[model samples]
Target: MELRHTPARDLDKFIEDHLLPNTCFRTQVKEAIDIVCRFLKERCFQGTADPVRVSKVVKGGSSGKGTTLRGRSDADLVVFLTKLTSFEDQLRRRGEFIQEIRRQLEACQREQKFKVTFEVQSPRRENPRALSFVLSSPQLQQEVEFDVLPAFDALGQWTPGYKPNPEIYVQLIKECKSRGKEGEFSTCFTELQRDFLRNRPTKLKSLIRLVKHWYQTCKKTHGNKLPPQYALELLTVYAWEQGSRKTDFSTAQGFQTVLELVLKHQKLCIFWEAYYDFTNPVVGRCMLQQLKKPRPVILDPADPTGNVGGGDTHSWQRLAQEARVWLGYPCCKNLDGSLVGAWTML
Candidate 1:
């Protein structure tokens, strides 16, 4: 169904109409996670020759973020292997490790031990990181896509509300310098990434799902040139944090504010102190350098090296154009015909 030109007037109805994930979809996601967890524990670890042990399988992406949409659920299954002691090791050996996992999954399908449909692909020369697959469940009549990533066990040493040691960032920064691929090691911090959005208010999460739905819809027509979805997610969080603090706020106002931020992406520079702070000298210095690099600097709350907003200008321009058009819709204006104000710049 097409969204109304004046979606702001019926924003709540729009979410209920198009954004909420149905019960069946939730059931299928649970079922899919169960099977994948079992396979990773029982089979993937049993036969591998890699020196690393499976520390944990962090379920990330929309699944871990609690923003899964109806009919289009995606999960990032990060297998944090203990053998990957450093980010360098993760980058160096992840290709072989992912290939091994793929072979095992193919064999599982062959032996009829796993009943889901799995699709495997050849490793890309440019970025051979995740073992990509689509798991289809006949019983649930749904397909949940997965990206199995092998990562360094950065979170194994973590405790509740305990900030990661600054040495981790120091090491990560060193690794990026030694090897020019920055932000490629983000999967190592999957737990922190997932936890960033996990405890947010329900209304904020609904705003995220709504932004995601719009992003997906725009992607269909805009093709493959949009800015990173994670960037948009972070922008939504920043909007809510700056625009309103109450547990309950106007959904239409929140949505409109996020669009406003997109329009002003060139001047956007945001970060969160929930997990990592700038007090540590090394982290502070490195972040200062990162912040100096470019505009729209939305650093990953978990991984400082991941500049999620470092996308090309054309993509942001296109999204801003869409957002500008959306602001003109009925949803972005108040009942008195006044336009809603966006969050003040940080």
Candidate 2:
């Protein structure tokens, strides 16, 4: 679908009143915990690892932070083992685990018949080792969806329980949230996020637009060369999202917006996704070189926007040359047919 753009006037109210609150709480979370814990307790008695020594719930991605909600919802509830077993071996024994848990609960009979109902899901084609079960226990309170993953026991790596490091992708999420929160955004961003939740596509497009706009602005304002930090800032604004927080750069400030968005969108990056894309080779070779990096050498001495230095303009000059020859940006060349003077991408 084409992106929807809301006018600046109506944007704030729609997002604040309609969109932001869903990000506040995770429904089915508490009840799901109750169901999972009961099942685990039964497993422990039957010797399926130790009885959930500890457990936690983690929101899986940028969706939690208000990025896009297009991908998988990977929320997880994991049981930590006090003992070790191979996932392969555990697979063979899992049928028993299911049967025992089912039988124990189903033992109660009415009209001389016992009833138990469950859906056992094993690894399909894409995820071979992953298996999960959906169960409804009137004995328990509600229906719950379980995602079961085991911890590997490869010496010194035996940390119990599942804890997601959402920070690794915080940047992308924070930025989308900021634009959404300030209502400065124009896209049809219906989603909001609290932690590692889902984001809307309008938000994702907004992020891409922000980066493109910043690049264009840098080219127009400061020649083609912009600062590494500014690019980070552009991406930051779209990525960093905290629910209903103040704009990070204004009098009301939030954490680095890009860092926040990155926390949410880290999955989209190739295997190299990170909290900081600074040192990434693709960032350095393609994005860094292709993008407009701010040059500090050409700042006017009296300019207040943070000066690099006065008139040391080679970086800007290089970017201008690249954009004209490679990118075909028309505004940069001088009327006499030579490149613009002392250009720098801010």
Candidate 3:
């Protein structure tokens, strides 16, 4: 919380004052996103012998998805490049494309495209999957950071709720089996991930912010001993999905439900058939195998390859203890001397 987020003495009050993103910053981040999109789509490939077209661009992350906290905002532009024709092509040939993008970006950086300065990070690996950096507009607070992820456009254009042909999942299963890289291609399906959360009511996103804030606080106490903030995010969504899907519900109870789920992390086998399903013969067999591996299995709804909840035993052990402590916080207190109740969930 560049709000220097102190633990909420009163949770709802904390969210209203400290967690909701500033409207001005929201507009600013969108402006920066627009600038970057213009740069990549229109100018990044200009005057080259052969142009690598941006097939499409998707806005993701907390910034694009309306779950941003006041102090932290991030944008993920999953740039589906026309050069990389398939998932395998992206795996093998993307570093060249990534290098080419950096070359163009820096060259354009020499020019003031938007008069905004780019503090682009060089790739840590020789062959990189993503390029990350920050976009600053003249000392703006916690400038909008970005991940320009070059991806294979495996799922062509989508309607609001378009279901892809199951062959896509079928191919993905085979790709993971051969490469032993189950979650490598998640960037390719960033659109699905964004759609999964973005369509929820605004209040649910607020609950996501509260839970993420709590997760960050837990991290401070536990030292890198926690699972991803994303894991907690999905947990909150699941809690709401099972317990209450209404637009207005008790934020305390929603927050409490997520905490309760964390306490029972050993029994979590959360997955959604929103994008891909187990009804398909081959994909179903493989996913069933995934569920068999262990408890606390949270499959990525969009990318079947990922089990974002698959961390070691000790991390959950430490976090469950933290969850218990949070249960006693004033944030979890209900009026009339009762603690907030968790939504009915797994």
Q: Whose TM-score is greatest here?
A: 1
Residue pairs with backbone atoms closer than 3 Å in model 1 (clashes): 6-330, 8-331, 52-83
Encode model 1's per-residue lDDT on 17-121: one tens digit a residue: 778888877888788877887788778876566455677887888888888877766677888776777777878788778778878888888886655444544
- Global CA lDDT of candidate 1, please? 0.79
Instruction: TM-score each candidate.
Output: 0.92, 0.34, 0.90
Model 1 Cα shift for residue 316 (angstroms): 1.2
Worst 10 residues of 2 by lDDT: 184-193
**Candidate 1: stretches off by over 4 Å:** 48-51, 115-123, 137-141, 334-338, 343-346
TM-score of 1: 0.92
Query: How large is the C-alpha RMSD of every model relative to the true structure?
Result: 2.3, 17.0, 3.0
Residue-level lDDT tens digits of model 3 in 1-346: 3312233335667788888988877777787788788888887755477757888888877765678888665688888887776788888877877677777777766775433344544546756777777776553544777878788888977765877788988888898889788888988887788788889988899889988887887788887778877788888889999999899988888888888889889988899889878789988887888788677888888888888885577888888998898787667775455776778753
- Candidate 1 Cα deviation (angstroms), residue 260: 1.1
Model 2 per-residue lDDT at 143: 48
Model 2, 1-346: lDDT tens per residue?
1112322233233334433424313444444455556545553344545353323222222333433222122333333333334333333444444444445445533322323343444333332222355545444443444554433221223122222233312322334244432111111111111211222234433343333433454466565354332333333333333232223221111112332232323122211221124354432342233123333221111111112321224543443343343222222223443423321112
CA lDDT of each prediction against the hidden true structure: 0.79, 0.32, 0.78
| Model 1 residue 69 distance off true place after TM-score fit, in angstroms | 1.2
Clashes of 2: 54
**TM-score pick, better of 1 and 2:** 1
Q: Considering lDDT, where higher is better, how would the candidates rank from best to worst?
A: 1, 3, 2
